[PDB]
Structure formats: structure tokens, C-alpha cells
């Protein structure tokens, strides 16, 4: 009986993780207080603090106030559950000790950054993929609790509405935009996940999106219109011109052809059966005299040349639009 008595059986208390040394515990139920049992004499009562995690704290042995110790760090993420049990002793010399318990709840602080692991990504994607196609999912982790761990995803740069991301799931999908390998063959997306604590932290990942090829882009002649004067004395074999085209797809097989050769004499009049006159090299586009030329037979030739990508996956983007045009004015030879 004659031992000192605390005001409470158990003092309920709390403290914020990462509090610096000196920080008193918030003690929900009054101050930690014991008094000597003898109502006639006076007797000094000192306080002690014991238990497996008492090393995190120091008790003011005179006032009984519990503060955070120097050296140590209170880590919410290091205790499951986030709840300590400590014994308090009241000492009066020549008396048995007082007993109370100090139960302490460690409070969470937003002190973990939303982390991506892996912290970067690479994905291949086929061009002409329709709106809303699901490209990649990205997940970040957070060792905080409650809202301080609840993450919200968002594309910061590299995107321009061509890719969108679900704020919750982190699923990157294609936006309402044409993904054309020829217009842009790759993307480097900066993607941030932000926590919802009041001081909100964020962390970053980099999604490379390599656009794969469909052979879907027609060859283009770089020299579409061309007039050339050739001597009627030009022998067969003689290169007089070269049409040249480019397909912007990944592995084209270009083939140059002559679609027609219209011929006209010097009185501006149709001369038929003169397709033997010229020939285009099927790979290079080099145009040569093929048969003997005579001005007195043919004065002008209009020649149309096409080019096909034989590898093209789409049939309506196979051929040159427009075809190449080559007028060939024939020069006179005389005495
Ligand atoms: Ca912590
Ligand atoms: Ca925390
Ligand atoms: Ca956080
Ligand atoms: Ca394309
Ligand atoms: Ca293509
Ligand atoms: Ca093509
Ligand atoms: Ca002649
Ligand atoms: Ca002549
Ligand atoms: K007393
Ligand atoms: K005493």
C-alpha cells in the first residue's frame, strides 16, 4: 500500500517518427505523475523507464517527463505494429516501487518517396495501333501508410496527348492520335508517381517506346518532272537521265518501271510503237537510250515512270503518287 501511486494505471501516449532529441511525448492522459503514500511526511519520488524499446527515450528522473533520446531515430516503417509497451517505476527510498505502464503509438510521417523498380522501361509498339491500345503498365512502391502511400500516376513530358496514363492503375495507353513510325520512331516518356500526403513527394521513371514498322508509306520520287535534250546520234546504252525515289519504311524493295512512252514527230503528231526507245534500270532508276533514235521519225518523247515498294504491307501505298515524268526533246543532226 505504502508504495507511491500513479494517477493512471496505463498512460496512453504518441510521438511522430523522426522527432529530434528533446521532443516530449504527447501523453493523452494527464502528466506522468506519482506521489508518496504517506500524507504526513514528505518523500521524494523519482521516475524510471524500462522495456525492450526504452533505449529510444529518456525520462527526466525528477519530473517523469519522457523525451526522445540523442543518437536514436524513431522509424514508423521499422515497427509492426507501430505501438510500444514500456514500464514506468516510481521509487521512494525504503518503499516498494510504484507501477504504471506507458503505451506509445508511433505516428507515420510522409518520409518515403514513391519509387519505381525497375526505375526505367523499354517497350516495342506497332504503328497504326488504334486509340486506347494498352501499351505498358508501370508500378511504383511506397513504404508509407494511408494517404502517404496512396500513389497517383501522370505523364510529365514526351507525350503530347499521344499517350495517356490511368492516374490509379498506371496503365499507359495510346491517346486519340495516329502513331506513325515515319513521323516519330521512338518516344522517351518522363512518368511521375506522386503520393497524397500533405507534403507530397514524387518519384520518376523513363519509358522508352520503340515504334516498330509496318511497310505502309508509298515511295516518293525526288525528281518528278524533268525535260532532257538528246542528240539523235546517241547510241543505245547511253544514260540520259535518272529518276530517283525514297520509301521511308524500314526495308523497302524499290522497283522502277516505264508505264508509257508517247512519241510525236516534228509536226507534233502521234507516232506509235516506239516503246523500244528507252529503258529504266529496275533497281537504280537510271534511264538509257534503248533503241536507235531518229529525229526525222520522232522529235519528242513523253515518258512516264513509276516506282513500287514490293515489300509494302499496304497495297494502296505501294506506288509513287505522282509517277515521274520525263520529256525527251530530240536534237537534230545534219551537214
Ligand atoms: Ca521512417
Ligand atoms: Ca513514414
Ligand atoms: Ca510517400
Ligand atoms: Ca506510317
Ligand atoms: Ca512504316
Ligand atoms: Ca512502302
Ligand atoms: Ca536521223
Ligand atoms: Ca537529221
Ligand atoms: K506526502
Ligand atoms: K522514504
UniProtKB/Swiss-Prot annotation:
| Record's subcellular location | Cell membrane
Q: Which residues are glycosylated?
A: 61, 97, 176, 215, 242, 310
Q: What is the effect of changing residue 72 to V?
A: In strain: CAST/Ei
> Tissue specificity, please?
In adult animals relatively high levels of expression are found in testis, skeletal muscle, heart, eye and thymus, and lower expression in kidney, lung and brain. Found in the sensory hair cells of the inner ear.
Q: Name all Cadherin domain ranges.
A: 7-116, 117-221, 222-335
Report the domain of life of the source organism: Eukaryota
Quaternary structure annotation from Swiss-Prot or TrEMBL: Interacts with USH1C and USH1G. antiparallel heterodimer with PCDH15. Isoform C1: Interacts with CAMSAP3; leading to inhibit CAMSAP3 ability to induce microtubule bundle formation.
- Disease linkage: Defects in Cdh23 are the cause of waltzer (v) phenotype. Waltzer mice are characterized by deafness and vestibular dysfunction due to degeneration of the neuroepithelium within the inner ear.
- Summarize the protein's role: Cadherins are calcium-dependent cell adhesion proteins. They preferentially interact with themselves in a homophilic manner in connecting cells. CDH23 is required for establishing and/or maintaining the proper organization of the stereocilia bundle of hair cells in the cochlea and the vestibule during late embryonic/early postnatal development. It is part of the functional network formed by USH1C, USH1G, CDH23 and MYO7A that mediates mechanotransduction in cochlear hair cells. Required for normal hearing.
Q: What is known of its domains?
A: Three calcium ions are usually bound at the interface of each cadherin domain and rigidify the connections, imparting a strong curvature to the full-length ectodomain.
Protein name as catalogued? Cadherin-23
Species for this entry: Mus musculus
Q: Which residues of the full protein are shown?
A: 1955 to 2288 of 3354
Amino acid at each position: 500500500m505504502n508504495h507511491p501511486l500513479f494517477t493512471e494505471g496505463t498512460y496512453q501516449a504518441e510521438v511522430m517518427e523522426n522527432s529530434p532529441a528533446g521532443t516530449p511525448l504527447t501523453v493523452l492522459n494527464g502528466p506522468i505523475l506519482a506521489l508518496d503514500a504517506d500524507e504526513d511526511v514528505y518523500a521524494v519520488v523519482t521516475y524510471q523507464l524500462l522495456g525492450t524499446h526504452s533505449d529510444l527515450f529518456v525520462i527526466d528522473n525528477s519530473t517523469g517527463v519522457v523525451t526522445v533520446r540523442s543518437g536514436i531515430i524513431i522509424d514508423w516503417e521499422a515497427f509492426s505494429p507501430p505501438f510500444l509497451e514500456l514500464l514506468l517505476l516510481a521509487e521512494d527510498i525504503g518503499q516498494l516501487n510504484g507501477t504504471a505502464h506507458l503505451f506509445i503509438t508511433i505516428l507515420d510521417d510522409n518520409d518515403n518517396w514513391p519509387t519505381f523498380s525497375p526505375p526505367t522501361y523499354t517497350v516495342h509498339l506497332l504503328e497504326n495501333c488504334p486509340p486506347g491500345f494498352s501499351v505498358l503498365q508501370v508500378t511504383a512502391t511506397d513504404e508509407d501508410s494511408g494517404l502517404n502511400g496512396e500513389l497517383v500516376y501522370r505523364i510529365e513530358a514526351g507525350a503530347q496527348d499521344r499517350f495517356l496514363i490511368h492516374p490509379v492503375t498506371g496503365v499507359i495507353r495510346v491517346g486519340n492520335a495516329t502513331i506513325d513510325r515515319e513521323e516519330q520512331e521512338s518516344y522517351r516518356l518522363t512518368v511521375v508517381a506522386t503520393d497524397r500526403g500533405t507534403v507530397p513527394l514524387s518519384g520518376t521513371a523513363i519509358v522508352t517506346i520503340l515504334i516498330d514498322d509496318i511497310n505502309d508509306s508509298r515511295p516518293e520520287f525526288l525528281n518528278p518532272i524533268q525535260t532532257v535534250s538528246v542528240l539523235e546520234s546517241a547510241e543505245p546504252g547511253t544514260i540520259i537521265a535518272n529518276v530517283t525515289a525514297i520509301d521511308l519504311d524500314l526495308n523497302p524493295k524499290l522497283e522502277y518501271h516505264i508505264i508509257s512512252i508517247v512519241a510525236k514527230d516534228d509536226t507534233d503528231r502521234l507516232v506509235p510503237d516506239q516503246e523500244d526507245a528507252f529503258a529504266v534500270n529496275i533497281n537504280t532508276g537510271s534511264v538509257m537510250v534503248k533503241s536507235p533514235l531518229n529525229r526525222e521519225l520522232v522529235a519528242t518523247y513523253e515518258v512516264t515512270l513509276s516506282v513500287i515498294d514490293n515489300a509494302s504491307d499496304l497495297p494502296e501505298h505501294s506506288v509513287s503518287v505522282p509517277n515521274a515524268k520525263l520529256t525527251v526533246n530530240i536534237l537534230d543532226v545534219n551537214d
